[PDB]
Enzyme design. Structure first.
Site, PDB file in Angstrom:
ATOM      1  N   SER A  19       0.834  -1.202   0.000  1.00 48.53           N
ATOM      2  CA  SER A  19       0.000   0.000   0.000  1.00 48.53           C
ATOM      3  C   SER A  19       0.868   1.250   0.000  1.00 48.53           C
ATOM      4  O   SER A  19       1.968   1.231   0.548  1.00 48.53           O
ATOM      5  CB  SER A  19      -0.899   0.031   1.246  1.00 48.53           C
ATOM      6  OG  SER A  19      -1.759  -1.110   1.255  1.00 48.53           O
TER       7      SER A  19
HETATM    8  C1  LIG Z   1      -7.923  -3.558   9.919  1.00 51.30           C
HETATM    9  C2  LIG Z   1      -7.828  -3.465   8.419  1.00 51.30           C
HETATM   10  C3  LIG Z   1      -7.276  -2.116   7.983  1.00 51.30           C
HETATM   11  C4  LIG Z   1      -7.046  -2.189   6.479  1.00 51.30           C
HETATM   12  C5  LIG Z   1      -6.781  -0.826   5.858  1.00 51.30           C
HETATM   13  C6  LIG Z   1      -5.882  -0.911   4.626  1.00 51.30           C
HETATM   14  C7  LIG Z   1      -4.394  -0.984   4.985  1.00 51.30           C
HETATM   15  C8  LIG Z   1      -3.531  -1.161   3.754  1.00 51.30           C
HETATM   16  O1  LIG Z   1      -3.820  -0.523   2.722  1.00 51.30           O
HETATM   17  O2  LIG Z   1      -2.547  -1.939   3.796  1.00 51.30           O
END
Ligand SMILES: CCCCCCCC(=O)O
EC number: 3.5.1.97
Lengths: 546, 164
Positions: free
Chosen positions: A1
């Site tokens: 990400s």
């Molecule tokens: C508890 C789940 C939170 C997920 C949000 C996305 C995080 C990412 O983009 O890596």
């Protein structure tokens, strides 16, 4: 990400701006879904959620936008058990032999005949948690076994935490709400608000061990490899208790990294360290954040972000849509030199031509150079001491860089790696003149859609993970929900897409509509105000009750 | 009952849910989500209930690419009744209401579904859901950063025999 928050000192409008580019699965239990939630007077938030969870996970509201990235913090610890020398189903704590607990589960299995059979399975548990076996690494022999203590098993606050985030007004309020509850399981949070604050938080649920305990409580061999592992034969290696922590055994909020700035913060799954290199985050527990070399995605982002020029929405969008293969910046110049040094070697001709013609991109129309480069890099990664300039902790943005072609053994090994990579590419079924978009696709029913982007390990900000299936690479994860949010006077202006579309069902009108848009890199308005929603010519409405 | 929502959809099937309280908000979310993703949620709930092998046999895998039987053992262990009960008892009233609404709205869609947007119509595993199922999904997500990454390893953990 990836995530970038921009503040008043760098944004063109003097207000906040946020780019959210989570890289997540394209199928299954972590498939994002867009929605906008409103309880008039007290809740108004829009973004994307995860299946079954009635809260917005990544999103925006009137004055705030936030996103998440997976962090490098540990959210569990392994415990190496010392077994009772008389009984391998008992283990020693402070020299005292304790029995393992057994919990049996029963599963129904549908057989070849179509009938159900019952299977019973025993799960062994220690005071720390269940035992785990990784054959050849974490064994259960007559001397030792490993248990795993997961900090999030006791985190009952996760849903409340995101409902609270959904109600947050600005960056200060978001920080209060997260630090107060400590319900975030395993992600960083980055945010920007209308007043132009940019926030990074590594505020998640992390096992706490007081700093003086780490040198003796760590398993040296395993921590060296990045596995959080503690000595389970010593009661002093229990997670430390601090009354300020929201949950027994977790790290208090005051001890976790936070950076509040007016220029920018960014993260691409590296540690807190170089969130903004003008203010490095150092001195945290090794369970929390370490000063490690950053990945090519963060190096790419920092290369675009550093300096004094204002950042416009379009600039952040283009960081994604450029599909620049940043790892090529580190090696392609020397690779091309090696190519010129070996003109007339038949094993290298096709590869060197493809590499020279290549736009250094992962665009639909990018040439076969990208494929040659990927196969080369997978082999380069296995070479010892081939970097011209290795990682330098004092120059973390610009190292490693270059190929040490002046070293004869490296030149030989690199040339062999390129010959081997070329042989692999040429073996596979790639029609001559075919481009990257011809190979990387997302299947939709009986059809395919070409997908731009490439693996994050190659420094492509628009990270796309694919797997070989038949004649193609099938997309399985990566860029998912995109939101780019700014804050003009009228209300939040958000632009983006859900790359894989709203519905996973081939029957739906929304199975591939945004995927066609993603292919063409044509982001869209995310309508939030009543005025924006009412302006949409596709608007439909239904009221339901029971 | 006392469940009501107003839903608007803009281009590309993005829902905008308005309600006066969390129960109605959840109702709208569960209904809108089911219209697009009923089969997905049912499959993932089968996984989090540890029921893959019951419906699909031991030959298949979950969407996380774990074999069905090891996946079922892991989720049966993770989502034991005592654990779900303790998790529920720790939820705020607002959260409980969101979850109750969501289950009711998803189930409303299932009662009315004629296959227009649901490819798994008629499958035995496409069933009404419970708030406990949403807790099962929540707990499955919670451990993705921890013991969930060791699911195969947990299933493989057995004591040594008489070997040299
Ligand atoms: C508890 C789940 C939170 C997920 C949000 C996305 C995080 C990412 O983009 O890596």
């Amino acid at each position: 990400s990836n995530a970038i928050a921009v503040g008043s000192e760098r944004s063109a409008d003097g207000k906040g701006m946020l780019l959210a580019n989570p890289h997540f699965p394209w199928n299954g239990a972590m498939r994002f879904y867009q929605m906008h939630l409103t309880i008039p007077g007290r809740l108004d938030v829009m973004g994307a959620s995860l299946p079954g969870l009635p809260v917005v996970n990544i999103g925006f509201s009137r004055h705030l936008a936030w996103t998440h990235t997976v962090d490098t913090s540990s959210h569990f610890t392994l415990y190496r058990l010392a077994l009772d020398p008389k009984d391998p189903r008992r283990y020693l704590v402070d020299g005292r032999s304790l029995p393992l607990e057994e919990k049996s589960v029963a599963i129904e299995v549908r057989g070849a005949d179509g009938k159900l059979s019952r299977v019973e399975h025993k799960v062994y548990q220690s005071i720390y948690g269940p035992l785990v076996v990784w054959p050849g690494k974490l064994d259960w022999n007559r001397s030792e076994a490993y248990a795993l203590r997961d900090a999030n098993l006791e985190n009952t606050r996760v849903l409340q935490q995101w409902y609270s985030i959904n109600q947050a007004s600005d960056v200060a309020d978001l920080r209060r709400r997260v630090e107060a509850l400590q319900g975030i399981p395993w992600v960083n949070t980055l945010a920007a608000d209308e007043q132009g604050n940019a926030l990074y938080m590594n505020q998640s649920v992390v096992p706490y061990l007081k700093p003086e305990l780490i040198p003796a409580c760590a398993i040296p061999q395993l921590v060296a490899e990045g596995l959080p592992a503690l000595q389970g034969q010593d009661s002093r290696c229990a997670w430390s208790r601090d009354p300020a922590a929201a949950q027994a055994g977790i790290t208090p909020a005051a001890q976790l990294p936070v950076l509040l700035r007016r220029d920018f913060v960014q993260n691409s799954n590296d540690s807190a360290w170089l969130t903004n290199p003008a203010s490095p985050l150092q001195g945290f527990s090794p369970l929390v954040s370490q000063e490690k070399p950053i990945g090519p995605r963060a190096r790419y982002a920092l290369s675009r972000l550093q300096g004094k020029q204002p950042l416009e929405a379009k600039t952040l969008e283009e960081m994604v849509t450029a599909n620049h293969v940043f790892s090529a910046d580190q090696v392609l110049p020397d690779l091309l030199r090696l190519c010129r040094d070996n003109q007339g070697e038949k094993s290298l001709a096709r590869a060197c031509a493809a590499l020279a013609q290549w736009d250094r991109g992962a665009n639909l129309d990018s040439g076969s150079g990208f494929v040659y480069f990927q196969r080369f890099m997978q082999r380069f990664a296995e070479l010892d001491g081939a970097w011209k300039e290795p990682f330098d902790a004092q120059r973390p943005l610009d190292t490693p860089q270059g190929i040490a072609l002046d070293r004869p053994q490296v030149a030989t090994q690199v040339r062999q790696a390129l010959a081997d990579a070329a042989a692999e590419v040429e073996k596979s079924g790639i029609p001559d003149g075919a481009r990257w978009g011809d190979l990387q696709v997302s299947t939709r029913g009986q059809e395919r859609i070409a997908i731009p982007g490439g693996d994050g390990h190659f420094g492509v900000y628009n990270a796309i993970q694919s797997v070989r299936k038949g004649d193609h690479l099938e997309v399985v994860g990566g860029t998912s929900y995109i939101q780019l949010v700014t804050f003009p006077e009228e209300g939040p202006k958000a632009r983006g897409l859900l790359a894989f579309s709203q519905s996973s069902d081939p029957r739906s009108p929304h199975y591939r509509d945004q995927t066609e848009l993603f292919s063409r890199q044509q982001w869209q308005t995310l309508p939030f105000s009543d005025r924006q929603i009412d302006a949409d010519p596709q608007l439909q409405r239904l009221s339901i009750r029971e | 009952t006392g469940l009501a929502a107003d839903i608007r959809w803009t281009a590309y099937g993005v829902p905008h849910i308005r309600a006066k309280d969390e129960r109605g908000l959840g109702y709208g979310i569960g209904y809108a989500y089911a219209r697009d993703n009923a089969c997905l949620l049912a499959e993932e709930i089968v996984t989090a209930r540890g029921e893959r092998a019951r419906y699909f046999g031991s030959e298949g895998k979950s969407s996380a690419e774990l074999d069905n039987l090891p996946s079922d053992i892991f989720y049966a262990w993770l989502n034991q009744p005592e654990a779900l009960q303790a998790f529920w008892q720790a939820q705020t009233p607002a959260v409980r209401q969101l979850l109750e609404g969501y289950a009711a709205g998803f189930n409303r869609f299932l009662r009315e579904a004629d296959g227009k947007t649901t490819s798994c119509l008629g499958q035995p595993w496409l069933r009404a859901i419970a708030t406990d199922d949403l807790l099962r999904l929540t707990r499955r997500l919670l451990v993705e950063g921890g013991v969930g990454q060791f699911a195969d390893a947990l299933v493989a953990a057995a004591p040594p025999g008489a070997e040299k």
